[PDB]
Amino acid sequence: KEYRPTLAQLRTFVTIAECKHFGTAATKLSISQPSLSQALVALETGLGVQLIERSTRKVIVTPAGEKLLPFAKSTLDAAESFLSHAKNGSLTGPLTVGIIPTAAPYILPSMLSIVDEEYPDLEPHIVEDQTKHLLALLRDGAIDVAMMALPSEAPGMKEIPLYDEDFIVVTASDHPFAGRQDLELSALEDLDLLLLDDGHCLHDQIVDLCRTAVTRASSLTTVMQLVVAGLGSTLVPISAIPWECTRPGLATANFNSDVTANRRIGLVYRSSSSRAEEFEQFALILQRAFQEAVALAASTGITLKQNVA
Amino acid sequence: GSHMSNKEYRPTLAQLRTFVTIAECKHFGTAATKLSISQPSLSQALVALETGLGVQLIERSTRKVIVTPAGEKLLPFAKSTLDAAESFLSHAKGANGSLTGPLTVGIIPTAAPYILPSMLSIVDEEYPDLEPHIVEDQTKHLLALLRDGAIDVAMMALPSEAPGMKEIPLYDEDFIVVTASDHPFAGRQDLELSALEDLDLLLLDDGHCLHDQIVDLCRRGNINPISSTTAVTRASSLTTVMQLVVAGLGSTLVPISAIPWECTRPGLATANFNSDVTANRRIGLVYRSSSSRAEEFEQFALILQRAFQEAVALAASTGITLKQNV
Amino acid sequence: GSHMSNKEYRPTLAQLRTFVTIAECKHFGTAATKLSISQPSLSQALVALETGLGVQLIERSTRKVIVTPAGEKLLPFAKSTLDAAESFLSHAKGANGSLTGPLTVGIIPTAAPYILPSMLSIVDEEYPDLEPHIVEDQTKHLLALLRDGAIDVAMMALPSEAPGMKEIPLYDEDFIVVTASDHPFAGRQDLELSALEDLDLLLLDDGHCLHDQIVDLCRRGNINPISSTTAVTRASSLTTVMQLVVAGLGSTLVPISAIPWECTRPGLATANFNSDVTANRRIGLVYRSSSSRAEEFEQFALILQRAFQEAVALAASTGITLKQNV
Amino acid sequence: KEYRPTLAQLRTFVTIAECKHFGTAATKLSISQPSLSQALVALETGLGVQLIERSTRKVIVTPAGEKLLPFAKSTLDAAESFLSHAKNGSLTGPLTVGIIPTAAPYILPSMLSIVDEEYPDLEPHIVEDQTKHLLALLRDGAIDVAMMALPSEAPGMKEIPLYDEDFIVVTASDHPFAGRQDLELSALEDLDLLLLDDGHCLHDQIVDLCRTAVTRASSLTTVMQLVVAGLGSTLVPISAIPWECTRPGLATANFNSDVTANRRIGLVYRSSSSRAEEFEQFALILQRAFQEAVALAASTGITLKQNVA
Numbered sequence A, D: 001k002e003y004r005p006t007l008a009q010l011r012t013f014v015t016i017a018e019c020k021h022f023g024t025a026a027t028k029l030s031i032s033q034p035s036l037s038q039a040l041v042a043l044e045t046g047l048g049v050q051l052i053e054r055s056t057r058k059v060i061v062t063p064a065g066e067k068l069l070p071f072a073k074s075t076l077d078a079a080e081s082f083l084s085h086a087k088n089g090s091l092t093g094p095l096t097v098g099i100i101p102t103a104a105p106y107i108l109p110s111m112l113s114i115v116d117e118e119y120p121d122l123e124p125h126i127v128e129d130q131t132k133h134l135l136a137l138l139r140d141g142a143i144d145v146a147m148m149a150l151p152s153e154a155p156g157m158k159e160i161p162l163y164d165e166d167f168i169v170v171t172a173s174d175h176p177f178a179g180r181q182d183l184e185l186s187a188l189e190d191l192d193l194l195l196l197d198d199g200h201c202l203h204d205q206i207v208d209l210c211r212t213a214v215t216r217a218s219s220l221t222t223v224m225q226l227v228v229a230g231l232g233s234t235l236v237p238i239s240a241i242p243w244e245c246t247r248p249g250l251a252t253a254n255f256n257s258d259v260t261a262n263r264r265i266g267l268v269y270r271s272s273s274s275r276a277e278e279f280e281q282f283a284l285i286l287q288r289a290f291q292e293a294v295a296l297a298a299s300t301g302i303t304l305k306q307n308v309a
Numbered sequence B, C: 001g002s003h004m005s006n007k008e009y010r011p012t013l014a015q016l017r018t019f020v021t022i023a024e025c026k027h028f029g030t031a032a033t034k035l036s037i038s039q040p041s042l043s044q045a046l047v048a049l050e051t052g053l054g055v056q057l058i059e060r061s062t063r064k065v066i067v068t069p070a071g072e073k074l075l076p077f078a079k080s081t082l083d084a085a086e087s088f089l090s091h092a093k094g095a096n097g098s099l100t101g102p103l104t105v106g107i108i109p110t111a112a113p114y115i116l117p118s119m120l121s122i123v124d125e126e127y128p129d130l131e132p133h134i135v136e137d138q139t140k141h142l143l144a145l146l147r148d149g150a151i152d153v154a155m156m157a158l159p160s161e162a163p164g165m166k167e168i169p170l171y172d173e174d175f176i177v178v179t180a181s182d183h184p185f186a187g188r189q190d191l192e193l194s195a196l197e198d199l200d201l202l203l204l205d206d207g208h209c210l211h212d213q214i215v216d217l218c219r220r221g222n223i224n225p226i227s228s229t230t231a232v233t234r235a236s237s238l239t240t241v242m243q244l245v246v247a248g249l250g251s252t253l254v255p256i257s258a259i260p261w262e263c264t265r266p267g268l269a270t271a272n273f274n275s276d277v278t279a280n281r282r283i284g285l286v287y288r289s290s291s292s293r294a295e296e297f298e299q300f301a302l303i304l305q306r307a308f309q310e311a312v313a314l315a316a317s318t319g320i321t322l323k324q325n326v
């Protein structure tokens, strides 16, 4: 035959060999004495090896059996180990998170601190990269969830909204809009805007736009350099204010209440995942992290955008 | 949720084999073909496993399979369960007794001397109809001979990276550090990879694999990341190196099987890397994939494993302190 | 011997060019063709050099040329002599003034912010008819744009390993180590490669090349030998990394040009590797080999070199201690 | 033109720029004042740049010249550096030596010690490998010289003989030839010889031969293992006696005076090399190293082969 032993057969062998009685062994395995015998005989017939000698009062392991016993035992130990590691509505184990570059720096320390202090069994793994790369990794299973601007517009993905994050206007210190808090969308025409692909959504009740020597930057650092040097102005998410907007050479302004200038940040994951509940719990952490970043921005004394509604 | 872990459930080997195959193939079609079962029954077995455990192991899309993080964590445990079962079966063919006739074995020079007496003794006593022929030579020569049929099997460091071959893993063999008696690291048992800078290591092409959790000096991408800073650019023999170590012109790494023969003479001391450092080699048996003698070679592998275990106990019996691992 | 060194002899650049070409080509035929001279006159020039010096540089066989050990030792010195002469000529075309019209430049994110203001200032003041267009993005994007003609030149870490490109080397840029204020290595200026184990380095794909005389962690054979032991598997931005460093969750490497902008805020300290450690990157200009604008690009390279020199002086003026090299 | 400046032209420029007079400059360069002028004008015409202004009493470097001066100066410094590093019937600088595996271990420490103490400017580099590999490296210039058994029989190579090295017979302790010093070549038929490809040459006046489970070994260690275990006997070069033949489980024997059992060790190098004199000087070191190894062998108290002639 092309016989392969089963774990139940191996369990019968190991138990008999250690108990040295059929009665004791069958009771320890919660099976009948005929079934115990059947499984042993199936094993000995499959192998072509007598493992156990049976007498009236006692059982003896053959020399062939003593040689094979440690190997059967390691097989059962590994199976028990598999089961033990396979062991409930909570954030535990590995969680691999993609985060876009214009969000990551400003919330990552809060998020990691909260996980370390309050979710001690969670094992977070963070990948920071551009939206398109994050979605490719998500699709291929190299990350579990991606924190990014919504809508994702990615097939087969589900979205959990986290928060709306306002932008602030950042100019050179000497720019005539320095300190203004009532700008209209028309004010855009008077700035040499260098914008990043950061999910910004700009509109008011009439105009919808939610649709320099440097053609395009991928980093806010390149942009801020140009702004300090007087060659441009830009939009910065408010979470980045403490880190990016407090150095000399910069000033800030804001649009009026009637202008929307924000981005919708969300968690995106594969529809095929069973982990929706874990991701929702993780969302709560990210919302807190953002609120901590917002309070840090407010504590700089820089005036933040005011909104209606 | 109310569809979590099933208490009386125990996974079967067939269920574990379905899991491992899907996880490695990443398609249901190629997995079912490899297991010679239907695509519905593959699915049935996997769902039985996932329902028993209360854990999603695989995510299913139209074109694609993805192993979940829970699945990746459990994959090595399923694999060890199957490996132990295959090991049991392999040792149960001690009755089969297929090791007869001529067997020509290539063995690398930093392994052969230290396991050859055990292996030949075991063959002579327990496999009296086996007719062993041993060729001891450098890796490249052994592979040319293997390729051309002049040897049947080669015992060497894995990966072999040889076209047309199969590999049977035998064992991981640690190295010990060997210095001159006067070297400042003599006697240390907690050396880190940084110790390389002050060891003056003269290394052989002996399969050594050195790394810790942060730095990898192994992955031999056709360029050796450890350089020598000594008058000896390149040594091909351990005896040349040990002579240089006794003379105070460097230190080296020696396989633990070689300790009784090489590391007990005057002028030498030994040291070891710490638990967190890997400093070992993967020894394997390599043969031509077309061979009808796979089962004989697997039986021969078991003999080599015993021979190595005997060499390790001989090393231990010298009283020299060996590498500890986690 | 009585056919040793000639006292009044001075080597000429043409003689040195004959030597370097033969040494690299290893045939007289391909060397003479590359220099557009006859095979006899190539030989004549080499023999004039060897007779002047009293040193055999090349051994001649029928099929083969071999550079002598004396020759291998002198080869980098001949090469630096020719490079300096080419540099002189390249700077003498400051009068030529070929940098006009549109020039679209790709620059990697860990270089662009720190040299962009200098470069644009120099262009605006001294090359008023040049019309620069800057694209700042990750290496792979820049190379796709370069390949497709959407940019003319890319400023990036060498080697580029991009098909169809030429490279102009610009400069080697050292890194500085950046830690949290409380890190035990804060302030050190003598760190060895072993310090990696206790730094918790979060590294970017920024061209960093780390090695000393014994260990090479650079040679990126499509597999990163330094691993991270942190919650952050992979960061693509320096700002993410610096935030993590301030928060005490790791250390990093920062190009020295970025010191004024990135390394002067509270919560950070700096350190450096010792003289014997290399921790730098080779920055170069990469362009399509078919281009008729090679001379314009070489002139643009000189501007970038000045911009970098200005960024290094800005870094120096902060009072932060920079890496020393041998 | 496709003009390239010459070093002489650059030297004229740098000298004038530093001296600030044509007379002083021409004298410092040991050339005529017309020749100095000619070289400068050739440089300025080739470049299309005036580097020097000439007045009656004085010379002034133009702004274009001041900019170019450091580059000319580095060109001349590099040329002077080349010449300085290019600088006599002695063993100095790099010497890359191939040595066969059955010779290397037993002479390498003496040789390196002698070089380090007595030839402080020599920079030795040692490659130890099999004869065929050494010859491939020699041919390709990756080594300068190979220490090996003669004849090499390699095309285009020259040989320097170093010494004849005797072999000793090594058996298991219990072998009936233990301690014998008068063996004939016929004694070979009574040993299960495992021999290495080590250049051994065996003959007497009548028979010329100079022409186990282990089919073949490349290492003496594999062979000695088999000899201690009683499965073979072998031949060992006398230089290896202290290291290889003093452990328990071994005994030694020798052939009689009328038997030759030796190997001719030599240095082999490419005919195309000009370094014969250096190699001859290196040969003297190797001869001493071998004589030290021979005295070490003798000091073990093991009886060495006696020869006629």
Ligand code: NA
Residues within 6 Å of the ligand: A093, A094, A123
């Ligand atoms: Na994990």
Ligand code: NA
Residues within 6 Å of the ligand: D093, D094, D123
């Ligand atoms: Na050298």
Ligand code: NI
Residues within 6 Å of the ligand: A132, A133, C141
């Ligand atoms: Ni991309």
Ligand code: NI
Residues within 6 Å of the ligand: B141, D132, D133
């Ligand atoms: Ni070979």
